[PDB]
């Protein structure tokens, strides 16, 4: 493992993509998700988590960061450990 | 305190203490005078 290695690049790409997705409303986030929504194609702003504390102009939160990082690490684990199984 | 003593004086607690002591004395008698099929004479 090193900077620029395949595993490092996989995880960095995964976390960047996930955080961008839930920052711009492409993935369910703290301030906007399917809780109390209508259909699969539309998420809604969560009043309970609305203005829960952020200095990012889209309202991106630390819990959003932690959730996206956890999901990205989970996905990176799944993808990297594919091809490491013995068989 | 006093109420707890009253609680001890309840039927179950007193039965348990009385039968604990009784079993103790009977066990001690069967330890110090063991295997007594009949009263010797």
């Amino acid at each position: 493992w090193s900077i620029g290695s395949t595993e490092n690049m996989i995880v960095c790409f995964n976390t960047t993509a996930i955080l961008g997705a839930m920052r711009f409303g492409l993935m369910p986030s703290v301030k906007k998700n399917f809780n109390g929504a209508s259909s699969h194609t539309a998420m809604v702003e969560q009043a309970n988590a609305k203005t829960i504390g952020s200095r990012d102009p889209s309202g991106f939160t630390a819990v959003d960061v932690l959730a996206g990082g956890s999901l990205a690490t989970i996905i990176s684990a799944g993808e990297i450990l594919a091809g490491q199984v013995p068989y | 305190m006093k109420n707890f003593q009253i609680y001890l004086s309840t039927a179950p607690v007193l039965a348990a203490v009385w039968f604990t002591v009784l079993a103790g004395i009977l066990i001690e008698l069967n330890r110090f005078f063991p295997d007594a099929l009949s009263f010797p004479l």
């Binding site: 493992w1 309970n48 490491q84 | 069967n30």
Partner: protein, 742 residues
Amino acid sequence: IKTVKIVVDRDPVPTSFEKWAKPGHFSRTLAKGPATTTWVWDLHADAHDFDSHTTDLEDISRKVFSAHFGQLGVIFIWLSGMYFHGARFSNYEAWLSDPTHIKPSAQVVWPIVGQEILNGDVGGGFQGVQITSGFFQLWRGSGITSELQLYSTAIGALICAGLMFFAGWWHYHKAAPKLEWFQNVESMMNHHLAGLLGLGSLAWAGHQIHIALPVNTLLDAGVDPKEIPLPHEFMLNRALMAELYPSFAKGLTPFFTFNWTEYSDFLTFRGGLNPVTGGLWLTDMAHHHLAIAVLFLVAGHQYRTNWGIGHSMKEILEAHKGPFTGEGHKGLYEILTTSWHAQLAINLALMGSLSIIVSHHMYSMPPYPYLATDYGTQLSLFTHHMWIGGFCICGAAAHAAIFMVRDYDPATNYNNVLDRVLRHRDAIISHLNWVCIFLGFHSFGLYIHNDTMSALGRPQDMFSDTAIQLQPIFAQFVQHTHALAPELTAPTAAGSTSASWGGDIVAVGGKIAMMPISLGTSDFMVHHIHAFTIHVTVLILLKGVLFARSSRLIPDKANLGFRFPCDGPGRGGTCQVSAWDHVFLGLFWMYNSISIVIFHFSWKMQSDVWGSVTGNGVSHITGGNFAQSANTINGWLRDFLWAQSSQVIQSYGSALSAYGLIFLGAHFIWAFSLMFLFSGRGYWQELIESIVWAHNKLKVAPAIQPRALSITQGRAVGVAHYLLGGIATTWSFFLARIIAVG
């Protein structure tokens, strides 16, 4: 969307003995005092009926929480006792050197009345009562090599019990939470998955990796327990741990770079059993607990608590509805967040099923070193967890019925998934009853026909394997797919989950740790019997739950209560109508079924799995007579009950003489239960009247008037003594048999 937070009332109840001095404080009818001897039984019956004590749910929730704290303190006392006895009253250190020939024992009796004979020759220059709890195998699998470690954890357990009691006192008398605290089920699931199961499994995986794995590897290699380095010397000294398992020379770098394949020496997927100890590979168990920890840690982030991500369980219930089920699961969130009994029913049902699965999975895949070889502990664990499971299921039915009578509101359940069940309960119960009859007729005639044909001298007309083949083709198919799982459908597995599927019988020190289990016609018949008995128990319990509030016989049954004796001799006779009485009969059938499950287990294992290899094939305990004799009731009576009873009935004059005495005593208690069961209150009350006349003659009349037991209490005593006597008879029989034969 309420915010999840900590809420408490400060000093809600003072700590005082004034209520101890006054029995029956929790009620109103019991508070005034005893008028009759029924009052004592009423006091004890509603001691833990918190719903009938207070109307408000907050106080009930606090009472439940602190009662749970007290139970956990009791369990910690029990664990402290077991570890302390395993330290000062056992031969665990001797058993460690010779686990195959020394019988585990952690109870020594005082030599008072000739009971010293119960201190059997268990080996190791030691005498005591041979234990079957498997605690020695657990400690060996946990890496305990010295009695000081047992003593240390025993004292820890006692401290933890004191802490548990202190926590209960704190959370009832000092910091009792409000009702809105207990109703945070989202948070509960988040913590009880990620933090109870997830972090608990992670902690145990770490223990297994750092302590149990090196110690048990050295024990497997043949190293003396007194020469093994101490657990802290493995957990801290990384060179010492890496000497046994070279992956530890890489540190946590593979872990944090997703190079987890380097940990394949101590995190394996071997499958099967350790050929030396006869237990599951401990590297497999460590990897298991690690993955379980990860799965639960991930699954514990499902529910929204205080930040918008997550699920609301109300929403995911209400969104599941369909054309056949009306409104679907709407309103169940209110049921299960405003009724303790509903939650208790679900949790007891799942706990009971789980205990059953635990017994199955532990006999089939022995998780502890030298557990399978010790047939007595294996049978004991199986039978124990089966009985616990059946009891918990019966309780689940009881608390389902209690919720249905007390906490069920028709207004909040209009057209949901429960109300529609209540609207076609007749169809459910009639189909279940039909199924039950069918199953019984077919399965019993499978045995009765065989009895008849054998008695008539027509073995060719029997349902045995030779005559008529009722082969369990589906179970044999499943066995085949599981034996071939490590090749096609589980390619990374080095072996099957259990040796019971097929091939490569596992033997440790002559005796068989695990043997592939076959399934002939007797297995078909006994399994259909099991299904019959299960379905009848389910019939009784589900009929009690569904007809808990009303019936065509009694429509106004909800207001009669969950626990009433009858509605009178009218309508032809309305005895045992209450759902409590259904749990009575339900409990009875549960007992009956378990009695058959454990008998099947014991006979099948003694006949077709357990034994000793001597280089000339297997020498099973009973010689494989199950396949040809377990198709007849006479075969079970003769080759299982009569044949295997010789150990328990001839146990007098040996260490198993206690088992023989319990065998007789449990027979007595069962017959004594028949008194309470076959009789009724009116007779006993009149006999009491005559006896009270005799006492009044001598001015010995008690101030508390003697009364016969209530009809519900009479049934309660009857079922309790019946279950006690039957189970203790089977306990003494099984333990004496399996300890003597070995």
